[PDB]
Amino acid sequence: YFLWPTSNLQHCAAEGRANYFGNLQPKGQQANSLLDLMTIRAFHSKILRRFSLGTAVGFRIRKGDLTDIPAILVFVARKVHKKWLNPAQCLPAILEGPGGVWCDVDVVEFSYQMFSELVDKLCGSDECIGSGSQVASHETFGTLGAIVKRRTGNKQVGFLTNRHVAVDLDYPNQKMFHPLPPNLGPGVYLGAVERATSFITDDVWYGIYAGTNPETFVRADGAFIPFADDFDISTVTTVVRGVGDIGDVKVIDLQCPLNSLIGRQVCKVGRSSGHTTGTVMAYALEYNDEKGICFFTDILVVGENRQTFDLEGDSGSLIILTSQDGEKPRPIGIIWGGTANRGRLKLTSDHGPENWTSGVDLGRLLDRLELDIIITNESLQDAVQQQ
């Protein structure tokens, strides 16, 4: 018994969005934050969607390296010289949005098992369940992202993993086991999915009109599972194995400087690939997936030293910023997985394309789900008694 919106997604906010764009229509103070870059792309969403496989915001990638030039990333199937494009297809080097603020436009060529002691510990060989532990429904396997606790209601303690790992269609309930479901091997029952989110409109997720398409949604796939009534929550640790103690979530501020997210180093620990490291390359990837529907996904990561950042089954690991000042590493997202048709991007000519990985903004996901992540075992036992 679900409910979509009744008539408020057609000609009350469909022309209300066209009003924000219907109204507002050279050395000038170039864009400083993601908030500026997103608006520039949104205004030009017609000529940018005209020939592209998708767009994103970040820094311009020049001769294989990330620059310090704020730019809108435009993805194409095959990058060719300017000599093989009819004039309708070539893109300008610079765009101007509302209010004179500007940015660059560069082209990026784009397309849509490990064995270690740590991988075994995450797959049931350890004596504790935490971030990185394998979590499985009756069909698919995944990764437990983070220990969270509910804000309203019972204030029940549970964990957070992304959608399509913990939810299937034919089954009427979604039970989760570690490390295997009973129909496949041994495992302990963790609980069931109480509430999860699939799609959120851009204005409620980002706060702005990230596009002119009246049907624009955000791939915010994330699920919350409260620990079962008869489950021993004392076997849960908050130590991110292989990383250590982590801090609280740093929200992705659209107004802070660009290079505080773009280019920063991130790492994760996953069920399938252990501890891998990567670099954030873009933000707010736009659909260019023709159905008339516009989809967004927040984080885009690429692995370091040409090694892939994730594998199939890592869906649900915690995307964690590596410590730059000896502080506690703080998470900003959780790795999203799907659909498994995997996709590459081309950086250099002496090497082939490299696998990129998408993620969901943790700061925004924890808010629309009303959850607070637990960072130490002492603060955990507090929420255990609040139940």
Ligand X SMILES: Nc1ncnc2c1ncn2[C@@H]1O[C@H](COP(=O)(O)OP(=O)(O)OP(=O)(O)O)[C@@H](O)[C@H]1O
The residues pairing with 105 across neighbouring beta strands, listed in sequence order, are 72
141-143 sheet: strands from edge to edge: 141-143, 134-136, 175-179, 187-192
**Using rule CB under 6 A, residue 128 touches ligand X:** no
Q: Site for its own copies (CB under 8 A): which residue of 4, 25, 63, 324?
A: 4
State which residue, 27 or 63, has the beta carbon closest to ligand X. Answer: 63
Distance (Å, whole) CA 124 – CA 89 = 53
Give which of ligand X, its own copies, Mg ion, none residue 173 binds (C-beta under 5 to 8 Å, depending on kind).
its own copies
Q: Site for its own copies (CB under 8 A): which residue of 16, 28, 185, 244?
A: 185
Question: Where does 235-376 have alpha helices with state H?
Answer: 362-368
Strands 331-335 and 318-321, how do they pair? antiparallel
State which residue, 196 or 282, has the beta carbon closest to its own copies. Answer: 196
Give the footprint of ligand X on residues 47-76 (CB under 6 A).
51, 60-63, 76
Of 81-89, 146-154, 234-242, 317-325: span binding ligand X (CB under 6 A): 81-89
Give which of its own copies, Mg ion, ligand X, none residue 88 binds (C-beta under 5 to 8 Å, depending on kind).
none
- Tell me how far, at minimum, the Cβ of 267 lies from ligand X, in Å: 26
- Tell me how far, at minimum, the Cβ of 167 lies from ligand X, in Å: 28
State which residue, 60 or 178, has the beta carbon closest to its own copies. Answer: 178
Distance (Å, whole) CA 210 – CA 56 = 11
Give the footprint of its own copies on residues 53-82 (CB under 8 A).
77-81
The CA–CA distances, whole Å, from 336 to 230, 255, 362 equal 30, 24, 11
Distance (Å, whole) CA 384 – CA 326 = 30
Q: Site for ligand X (CB under 6 A): which residue of 186, 207, 244, 352?
A: 186
Nearby residues of 149 by Cβ (< 8 Å), 6 or more positions away: 155, 156, 157, 158, 371, 372, 374, 383, 386
Give which of Mg ion, ligand X, its own copies, none residue 91 binds (C-beta under 5 to 8 Å, depending on kind).
ligand X
Distance (Å, whole) CA 9 – CA 199 = 14
For residue 77, give both structure tokens.
Answer: 């199937």
**Using rule CB under 5 A, residue 38 touches Mg ion:** no
**Using rule CB under 6 A, residue 332 touches ligand X:** no
31-50 mask for ligand X (x: CB under 6 A)? --------------------
Distance (Å, whole) CA 9 – CA 25 = 24
- DSSP string of 243-264? TB---------TTSBGGGTTT-
State which residue, 72 or 373, has the beta carbon closest to Mg ion. Answer: 72
Query: Which residues in this chain contact ligand X in the complex, by CB under 6 A?
Result: 51, 60-63, 76, 79-82, 85, 89-91, 106-107, 186
